[PDB]
Amino acid sequence: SYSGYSLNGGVHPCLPFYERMLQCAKSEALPIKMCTAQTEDYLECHHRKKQYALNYAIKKELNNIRIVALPRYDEENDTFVPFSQATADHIFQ
């Protein structure tokens, strides 16, 4: 019952993960024990639990006072300069 389509009629983002998981499951004699990596990749694509845990950790760390100012970015050179550097278009000039 896995469609393989996205909401715009394209391809589901987890279709390659599902295909690799199915290939491993059919190939292996012990698919439950052996296809752990592919199955976990598919489960991470479907349930983004690892990303949600990362977001929880990032929110907890942002609740602290470790980071003050991030490096600003300019696209003309496609690079990051420190916040302390007085560049053009800066918020504080």
């Binding site: 393989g4 199915l22 059919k26 698919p31």
Partner: peptide, 16 residues
């Protein structure tokens, strides 16, 4: 059922 190689081989991708 999850341990059945035959039942896992009978599964396939849509359009496969």
């Amino acid at each position: 059922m999850e341990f059945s190689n035959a039942l896992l081989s009978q599964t396939k991708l849509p359009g496969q």
